[PDB]
Amino acid sequence: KDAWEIPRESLRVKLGEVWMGTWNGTTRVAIKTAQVMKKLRHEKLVQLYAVVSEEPIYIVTEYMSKGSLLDFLKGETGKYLRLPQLVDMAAQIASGMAYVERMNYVHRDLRAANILVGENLVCKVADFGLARLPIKWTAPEAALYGRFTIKSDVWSFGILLTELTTKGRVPYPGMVNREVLDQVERGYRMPCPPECPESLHDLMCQCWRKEPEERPTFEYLQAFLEDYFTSTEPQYQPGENL
Amino acid sequence: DAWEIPRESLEVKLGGEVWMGTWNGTTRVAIKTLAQVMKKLRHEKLVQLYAVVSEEPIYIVTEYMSKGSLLDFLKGETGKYLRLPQLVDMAAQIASGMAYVERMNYVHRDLRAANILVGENLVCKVADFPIKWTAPEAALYGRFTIKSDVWSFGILLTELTTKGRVPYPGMVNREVLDQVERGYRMPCPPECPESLHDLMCQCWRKEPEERPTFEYLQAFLEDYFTSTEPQYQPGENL
Ligand SMILES: C#CCNC(=O)c1cc(Nc2cc(C3CC3)[nH]n2)nc(N2CCN(C(=O)c3ccc(O[S+](=O)=O)cc3)CC2)n1
Numbered sequence: 001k002d003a004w005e006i007p008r009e010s011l012r013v014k015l016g017e018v019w020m021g022t023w024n025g026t027t028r029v030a031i032k033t034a035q036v037m038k039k040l041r042h043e044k045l046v047q048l049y050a051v052v053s054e055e056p057i058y059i060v061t062e063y064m065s066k067g068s069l070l071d072f073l074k075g076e077t078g079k080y081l082r083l084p085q086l087v088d089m090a091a092q093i094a095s096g097m098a099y100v101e102r103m104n105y106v107h108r109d110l111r112a113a114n115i116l117v118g119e120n121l122v123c124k125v126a127d128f129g130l131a132r133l134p135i136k137w138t139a140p141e142a143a144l145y146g147r148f149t150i151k152s153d154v155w156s157f158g159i160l161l162t163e164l165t166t167k168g169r170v171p172y173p174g175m176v177n178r179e180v181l182d183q184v185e186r187g188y189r190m191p192c193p194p195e196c197p198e199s200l201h202d203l204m205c206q207c208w209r210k211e212p213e214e215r216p217t218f219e220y221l222q223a224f225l226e227d228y229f230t231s232t233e234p235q236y237q238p239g240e241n242l
Numbered sequence: 243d244a245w246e247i248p249r250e251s252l253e254v255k256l257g258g259e260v261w262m263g264t265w266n267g268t269t270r271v272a273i274k275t276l277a278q279v280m281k282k283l284r285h286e287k288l289v290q291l292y293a294v295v296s297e298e299p300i301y302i303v304t305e306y307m308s309k310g311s312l313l314d315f316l317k318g319e320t321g322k323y324l325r326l327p328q329l330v331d332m333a334a335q336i337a338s339g340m341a342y343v344e345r346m347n348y349v350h351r352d353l354r355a356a357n358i359l360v361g362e363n364l365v366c367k368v369a370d371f372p373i374k375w376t377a378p379e380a381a382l383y384g385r386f387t388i389k390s391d392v393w394s395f396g397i398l399l400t401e402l403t404t405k406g407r408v409p410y411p412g413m414v415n416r417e418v419l420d421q422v423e424r425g426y427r428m429p430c431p432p433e434c435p436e437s438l439h440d441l442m443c444q445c446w447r448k449e450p451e452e453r454p455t456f457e458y459l460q461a462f463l464e465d466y467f468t469s470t471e472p473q474y475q476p477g478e479n480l
């Protein structure tokens with residue numbers, strides 16, 4: 001064992017198998033019941049508090065109040081979410097992934113389901129169970145050949161942008177996995193979502209490139225979305241949904 | 243108007259009379275012997291009106307649905323093999339029809355399995371235009387709105403998940419009126435996911451305004467097995 005190890009009795013309501021418990025009677029934690037979540041440490045990544053190595057293996061992390069990003073968009077709160085908040089959340093995710101990027105790691109499962117919302121629309125990347133150094137979300141070179149890179153996470157980020165601009169609607173509506181695999185290889189890309197700016201949709205298609213090394217880095221993705229409503233879309237005005 | 247047709251071209255009696263026949267010798271139709279609203283409403287998930295005979299004897303010609311009603315289809319021999327994936331799919335198709343009704347500012351006032359028809363490839367459409375099905379604010383005070391059709395949709399989800407069993411088993415209309423108003427809701431039916439049952443209780447809110455729209459209901463059922471229940475596995479009944 002190591003320094004991350006804690007006794008199984010040191011930590012004291014179900015959520016979805018992750019529970020909301022209490023660590024040392026003063027810390028609000030979350031317990032999910034590598035050595036990859038330990039090394040990675042960023043404000044936009046869900047922080048690991050402690051680990052249990054005895055059966056059953058526990059994972060003690062920080063607590064996010066608003067839950068999953070997918071539930072948050074589909075939920076009652078998500079219908080008032082406009083583009084300024086949505087691009088801001090995308091920027092927060094792209095911030096953590098940029099950290100993951102320069103750390104030379106791969107997430108291999110970047111999607112709204114694995115992103116948690118907290119107070120003040122704070123979004124953090126979670127679940128590094130497949131992390132190393134979902135076909136509708138996965139890059140084709142990874143869903144076929146197992147070529148998982150940071151540029152395969154950019155593809156998923158491109159898919160993620162559709163979930164945000166549609167409030168959590170499943171990518172490629174009406175299509176099944178084998179139907180997606182066939183269409184994507186043929187060049188089919190998801191069209192510009194209703195009331196979504198083309199500059200944002202262009203960024204999607206850039207994340208959806210046949211050539212992995214032609215997809216832009218998360219450092220670019222972060223900078224593009226953070227400076228969005230000034231450099232790219234300063235003429236923006238509110239609509240019915242976006 | 244312009245919906246009129248010559249009295250040509252009835253073959254068999256389906257089930258005020260309902261017949262399966264032919265129109266103009268080529269197209270298969272459903273003749274109802276013996277309104278003005280079915281002329282305005284057009285949607286792929288609403289039973290489409292074809293033609294009308296205005297003078298007595300009155301005759302209504304709509305599209306034909308082969309599997310009869312959704313209620314008979316569930317209780318019947320085919321409903322025996324119906325699993326939840328196909329059941330949530332049928333519920334999504336209906337919600338789509340009611341979402342059209344919703345954005346057209348209309349009310350159905352009788353959303354139930356008896357008033358929903360099934361065709362080939364498990365296609366379900368709303369038709370026609372019952373205290374166990376209708377909302378209490380509509381049953382007592384007469385407040386029929388689209389959010390009162392959402393209540394019925396909540397009841398509709400029970401029929402689907404129980405193969406068409408009458409809601410509130412062992413209870414009469416007097417029992418239902420009092421219990422529901424007392425806060426009583428139907429429990430989670432056997433082998434039915436609690437997420438789906440939560441959606442039922444949403445459609446069964448006391449305040450009509452807090453009940454979700456059919457635009458929401460449609461999306462929740464369509465993305466159900468990816469967003470809401472990804473780890474679903476087949477059972478004996480559901
Ligand atoms: C609004 C409101 C109330 N809040 C919640 O209802 C609420 C709060 C929360 N806060 C948390 C948890 C964590 C810990 C890193 C988890 N940090 N902050 N999390 C969740 N959800 C539920 C749905 N979820 C799942 O179903 C799942 C996915 C993968 C998974 O893989 S794992 O390898 O076993 C096993 C479970 C994921 C978490 N839900």
Ligand SMILES: C#CCNC(=O)c1cc(Nc2cc(C3CC3)[nH]n2)nc(N2CCN(C(=O)c3ccc(O[S+](=O)=O)cc3)CC2)n1
Binds near residue numbers: 276
């Ligand atoms: C499996 C199998 C064989 N299929 C059928 O046995 C079969 C097929 C069908 N297909 C249809 C009908 C329609 C038209 C809307 C009728 N489109 N597609 N309909 C029915 N029916 C439903 C309804 N039934 C009624 O009796 C009634 C309805 C309203 C009504 O109100 S109206 O204002 O008078 C007064 C009576 C009785 C069986 N039954």
